[PDB]
Amino acid sequence: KPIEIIGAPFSKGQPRGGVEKGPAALRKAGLVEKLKETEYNVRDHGDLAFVDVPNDSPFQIVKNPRSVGKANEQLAAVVAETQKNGTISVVLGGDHSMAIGSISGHARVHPDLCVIWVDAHTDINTPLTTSSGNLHGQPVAFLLKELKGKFPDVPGFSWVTPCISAKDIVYIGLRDVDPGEHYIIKTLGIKYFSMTEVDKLGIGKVMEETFSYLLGRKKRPIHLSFDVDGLDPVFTPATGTPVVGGLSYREGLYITEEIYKTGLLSGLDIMEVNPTLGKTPEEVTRTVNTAVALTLSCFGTKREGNHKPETDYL
Amino acid sequence: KPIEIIGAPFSKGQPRGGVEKGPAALRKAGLVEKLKETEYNVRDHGDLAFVDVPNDSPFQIVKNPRSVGKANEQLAAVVAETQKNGTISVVLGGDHSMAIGSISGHARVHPDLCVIWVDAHTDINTPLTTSSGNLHGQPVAFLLKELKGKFPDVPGFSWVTPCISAKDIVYIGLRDVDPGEHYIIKTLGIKYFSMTEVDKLGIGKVMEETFSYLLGRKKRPIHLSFDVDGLDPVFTPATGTPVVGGLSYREGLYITEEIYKTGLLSGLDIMEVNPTLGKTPEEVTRTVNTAVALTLSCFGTKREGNHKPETDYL
Amino acid sequence: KPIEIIGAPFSKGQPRGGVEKGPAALRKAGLVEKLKETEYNVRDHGDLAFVDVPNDSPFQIVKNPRSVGKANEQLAAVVAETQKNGTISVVLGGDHSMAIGSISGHARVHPDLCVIWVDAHTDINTPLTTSSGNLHGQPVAFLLKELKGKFPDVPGFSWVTPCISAKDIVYIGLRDVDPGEHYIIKTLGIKYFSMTEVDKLGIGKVMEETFSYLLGRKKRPIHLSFDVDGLDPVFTPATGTPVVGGLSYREGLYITEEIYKTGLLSGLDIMEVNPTLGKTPEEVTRTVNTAVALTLSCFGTKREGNHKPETDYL
Ligand SMILES: N[C@@H](CSCCS(N)(=O)=O)C(=O)O
Ligand SMILES: N[C@@H](CSCCS(N)(=O)=O)C(=O)O
Ligand SMILES: N[C@@H](CSCCS(N)(=O)=O)C(=O)O
Ligand SMILES: [Mn+2]
Ligand SMILES: [Mn+2]
Ligand SMILES: [Mn+2]
Ligand SMILES: [Mn+2]
Ligand SMILES: [Mn+2]
Ligand SMILES: [Mn+2]
Numbered sequence: 044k045p046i047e048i049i050g051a052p053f054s055k056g057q058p059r060g061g062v063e064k065g066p067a068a069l070r071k072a073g074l075v076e077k078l079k080e081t082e083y084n085v086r087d088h089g090d091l092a093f094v095d096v097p098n099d100s101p102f103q104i105v106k107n108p109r110s111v112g113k114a115n116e117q118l119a120a121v122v123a124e125t126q127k128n129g130t131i132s133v134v135l136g137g138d139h140s141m142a143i144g145s146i147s148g149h150a151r152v153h154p155d156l157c158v159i160w161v162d163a164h165t166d167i168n169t170p171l172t173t174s175s176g177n178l179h180g181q182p183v184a185f186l187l188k189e190l191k192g193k194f195p196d197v198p199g200f201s202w203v204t205p206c207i208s209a210k211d212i213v214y215i216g217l218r219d220v221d222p223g224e225h226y227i228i229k230t231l232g233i234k235y236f237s238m239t240e241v242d243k244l245g246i247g248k249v250m251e252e253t254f255s256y257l258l259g260r261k262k263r264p265i266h267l268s269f270d271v272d273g274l275d276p277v278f279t280p281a282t283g284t285p286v287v288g289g290l291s292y293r294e295g296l297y298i299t300e301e302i303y304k305t306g307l308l309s310g311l312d313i314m315e316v317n318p319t320l321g322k323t324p325e326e327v328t329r330t331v332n333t334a335v336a337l338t339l340s341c342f343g344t345k346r347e348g349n350h351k352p353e354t355d356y357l
Numbered sequence: 358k359p360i361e362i363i364g365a366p367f368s369k370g371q372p373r374g375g376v377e378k379g380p381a382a383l384r385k386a387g388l389v390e391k392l393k394e395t396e397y398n399v400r401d402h403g404d405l406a407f408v409d410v411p412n413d414s415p416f417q418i419v420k421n422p423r424s425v426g427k428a429n430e431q432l433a434a435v436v437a438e439t440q441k442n443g444t445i446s447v448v449l450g451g452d453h454s455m456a457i458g459s460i461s462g463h464a465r466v467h468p469d470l471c472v473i474w475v476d477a478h479t480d481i482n483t484p485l486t487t488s489s490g491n492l493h494g495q496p497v498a499f500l501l502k503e504l505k506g507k508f509p510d511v512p513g514f515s516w517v518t519p520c521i522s523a524k525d526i527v528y529i530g531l532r533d534v535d536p537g538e539h540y541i542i543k544t545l546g547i548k549y550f551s552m553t554e555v556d557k558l559g560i561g562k563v564m565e566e567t568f569s570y571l572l573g574r575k576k577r578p579i580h581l582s583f584d585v586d587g588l589d590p591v592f593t594p595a596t597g598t599p600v601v602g603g604l605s606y607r608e609g610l611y612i613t614e615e616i617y618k619t620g621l622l623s624g625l626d627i628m629e630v631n632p633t634l635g636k637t638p639e640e641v642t643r644t645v646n647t648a649v650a651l652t653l654s655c656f657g658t659k660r661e662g663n664h665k666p667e668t669d670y671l
Numbered sequence: 672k673p674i675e676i677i678g679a680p681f682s683k684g685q686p687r688g689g690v691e692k693g694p695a696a697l698r699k700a701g702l703v704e705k706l707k708e709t710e711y712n713v714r715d716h717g718d719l720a721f722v723d724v725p726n727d728s729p730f731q732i733v734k735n736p737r738s739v740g741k742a743n744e745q746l747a748a749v750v751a752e753t754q755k756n757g758t759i760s761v762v763l764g765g766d767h768s769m770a771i772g773s774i775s776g777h778a779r780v781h782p783d784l785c786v787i788w789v790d791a792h793t794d795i796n797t798p799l800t801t802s803s804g805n806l807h808g809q810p811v812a813f814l815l816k817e818l819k820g821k822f823p824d825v826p827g828f829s830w831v832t833p834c835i836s837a838k839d840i841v842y843i844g845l846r847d848v849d850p851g852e853h854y855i856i857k858t859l860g861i862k863y864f865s866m867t868e869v870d871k872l873g874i875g876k877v878m879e880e881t882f883s884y885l886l887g888r889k890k891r892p893i894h895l896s897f898d899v900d901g902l903d904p905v906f907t908p909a910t911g912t913p914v915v916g917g918l919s920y921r922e923g924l925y926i927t928e929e930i931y932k933t934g935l936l937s938g939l940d941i942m943e944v945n946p947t948l949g950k951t952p953e954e955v956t957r958t959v960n961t962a963v964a965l966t967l968s969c970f971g972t973k974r975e976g977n978h979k980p981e982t983d984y985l
Contacts (some may be wrong), residue, residue, distance in 0.1 A: 296869065296916060348848025349850060
């Protein structure tokens with residue numbers, strides 16, 4: 044099966060600059076090279092080039108709506124394309140607002156996909172409930188069907204179509220949820236596992252329930268939108284919104300290990316890696332590497348080790 | 358339901374100065390303000406003022422017995438009072454020796470309460486088994502019934518009455534127990550979960566067994582005496598007795614989260630926070646904040662998030 | 672029951688110098704003294720003195736084969752001796768290649784022993800599958816029966832006899848396995864718990880299955896070969912091969928605590944501690960201490976605490 048790396052050097056989803064340098068560091072850490080060494084065909088599509096919408100006025104509170112709507116429009120197109128040709132799309136990137144485009148382009152080719160969202164935040168704020176207007180905290184809002192027409196239309200997102208419902212998404216890692224965001228997820232009966240659940244249940248049982256809940260009836264494609272801040276700040280210190288008491292490095296690998304085993308991985312999001320937010324070179328390296336490592340886990344790399352088929356090492 | 362903050366800036370329970378500055382930093386970190394934002398009525402009773410017993414000679418090994426006996430006498434009175442009026446008493450404080458007074462005053466108004474003691478130490482040394490004489494490591498000894506008249510009477514604790522028995526107390530976090538202390542807890546068949554049990558069982562199952570063991574028959578009030586050193590030194594570095602390999606920040610929040618859900622929280626002890634023991638400002642801040650956070654957990658604040666009832670955020 | 676400390680300051684098992692300074696630091700940290708304080712008879716046999724084989728040419732890729740074969744030959748003899756007299760042998764040491772000698776000498780006196788191997792690596796590379804030739808990564812290869820005559824004879828290991836089979840060994844901590852190594856352990860149906868299993872199952876259940884799998888039928892002696900790098904780099908930072916996402920300080924104590932309770936501990940290996948690889952004095956101290964602590968756990972020291980029998984502390 045083929046794999047395609049898509050860089051999405053974008054950062055207008057949030058105020059802190061640096062995330063556009065994300066895909067660049069992930070590659071610099073040998074994400075491709077390493078990937079090639081697995082049982083998958085790798086092809087680097089390069090980093091999409093975004094054209095900055097001049098005079099992008101803030102739609103009420105929502106900031107840079109047109110720049111983000113155009114950036115995501117462009118990507119969704121590219122993702123749909125590689126999905127079309129039967130390959131797995133892997134989106135390295137800047138902020139998490141690019142998930143709007145990634146999950147959209149994916150949904151087109153596979154309208155029956157479900158989403159496993161590993162993040163410390165829900166990112167389900169509507170243009171009406173954000174307190175910052177930063178779009179990187181509203182992706183789920185544009186993609187959900189139930190949240191359709193529950194908020195005014197935004198400059199540039201016209202092209203979007205609420206493709207997935209609240210019964211096809213699952214959260215794992217939540218620990219910092221806004222009042223409104225909590226309202227929406229309790230209102231729409233969305234399935235999730237907050238750090239407290241992860242604590243009570245254990246990561247093993249979490250993944251167990253997440254699959255039987257999303258693949259119970261029909262076995263559909265899986266889109267893994269992984270927000271690097273879903274691990275405790277200790278492991279992935281270089282991000283915009285660190286939040287203590289989160290997933291651990293082991294837990295994050297186990298979650299990507301189990302998803303691999305389901306053989307249903309169709310799309311991936313290695314979002315929020317910001318090479319400029321590390322208090323020391325170490326931290327940034329720590330962060331870029333676990334991101335890399337998490338990605339390789341999604342595509343084979345097992346901790347127990349791996350060996351090439353049909354080869355007798357003795 | 359009402360809540361009442363009672364500062365007890367005392368520190369003669371142990372040699373290291375600084376803990377009396379405890380309640381002051383907890384408030385400085387917005388403990389009240391934040392508390393108010395929950396579904397509870399908050400009322401700051403202020404910091405009790407302790408009068409130093411002059412010429413307080415050491416009763417054999419036990420040090421500052423009269424100062425501690427008088428400090429705890431004063432508090433017990435105050436705690437009983439707010440307990441009397443039907444409010445939850447929250448004791449911020451200096452050393453853990455003030456637990457003698459807190460649990461006493463509480464016991465009066467509710468003689469059927471049980472105690473969940475999150476600490477790395479047992480603090481069940483009798484004036485006869487301490488090796489330091491520091492009283493902050495003997496609280497349980499004065500409160501237990503079975504340990505009645507098993508040690509000589511001390512200058513100033515006359516007013517105390519062994520109110521609870523060893524079948525109403527539960528330990529969670531133990532990892533540094535003296536020879537004698539271990540003897541006593543094995544002798545009196547006291548229930549506890551040492552870091553090893555927490556390791557074997559998982560925090561989820563720990564809490565499960567702790568409740569069915571203390572609320573199995575009758576559902577009684579719960580007194581949570583939380584010694585901040587019960588978390589690993591990494592999370593709460595500013596204390597008198599750091600001990601590695603302890604509870605983690607997540608575990609600590611889960612323990613306070615579950616206790617909240619039992620709806621039986623009557624008294625709380627946020628003991629041992631020492632603003633002057635942090636190797637760097639960071640450490641102190643780290644410590645004061647998790648202490649704060651643990652307290653808010655006890656009264657509502659959930660990681661999955663919260664929203665105000667009867668309010669339609671859409 | 673008696674205990675005997677045997678230093679094996681050897682380091683030709685791997686390229687990085689420093690490990691021969693291992694036993695010296697472990698003792699410098701009071702390993703003996705502390706040990707004495709337990710219910711065991713302690714006797715320091717001192718550090719074996721190894722004679723360097725001059726002109727030790729590399730057998731193909733395998734390096735320093737004669738120096739290592741002679742070093743291990745010497746030790747096996749000493750270990751068999753103290754095992755003979757009915758005492759427990761504790762081998763402090765340099766690299767893990769010395770396990771060949773330790774487990775051999777042990778097997779002689781107790782041919783029915785099983786091995787619990789706490790390590791991040793399998794160390795089951797045959798002189799034919801190593802990529803470095805470093806012997807500290809091939810111990811199991813020489814000791815296994817099934818791997819008999821599957822590789823050419825090496826200069827100096829003639830004296831060895833594949834004494835244990837793949838159904839008497841168990842791995843716990845694996846997270847960095849070579850392709851070949853993985854092949855061998857899957858081929859020989861060897862039992863193990865990789866960090867992923869530890870994650871899914873929990874350490875408690877791990878130990879549970881490890882015992883019922885090795886002591887299910889017959890209750891035999893246990894040889895614990897503990898590779899200090901089996902803990903995450905955070906706790907034992909001073910080693911040759913750090914690997915992230917490994918066992919935690921608590922987990923490591925639990926594993927040694929449970930093995931103690933089985934009352935079957937016959938031999939111990941406190942391998943790989945390298946006092947010269949610590950980025951700061953702290954790290955080395957951190958490392959030497961947990962090593963020490965893990966050892967004391969094997970012989971009694973419980974976290975819940977200990978008290979001397981027949982002594983009424985009241
Ligand atoms: N509540 C915050 C959410 S911050 C979004 C964090 S993320 N996961 O990087 O998208 C907001 O007001 O935007
Ligand atoms: N074993 C020690 C116990 S130190 C008490 C620690 S605490 N939890 O802060 O009260 C003593 O001799 O007092
Ligand atoms: N695959 C490595 C294994 S490194 C052995 C690590 S240890 N546990 O210290 O023996 C090799 O090529 O020797
Ligand atoms: Mn996000
Ligand atoms: Mn996030
Ligand atoms: Mn205490
Ligand atoms: Mn304590
Ligand atoms: Mn090893
Ligand atoms: Mn190793």
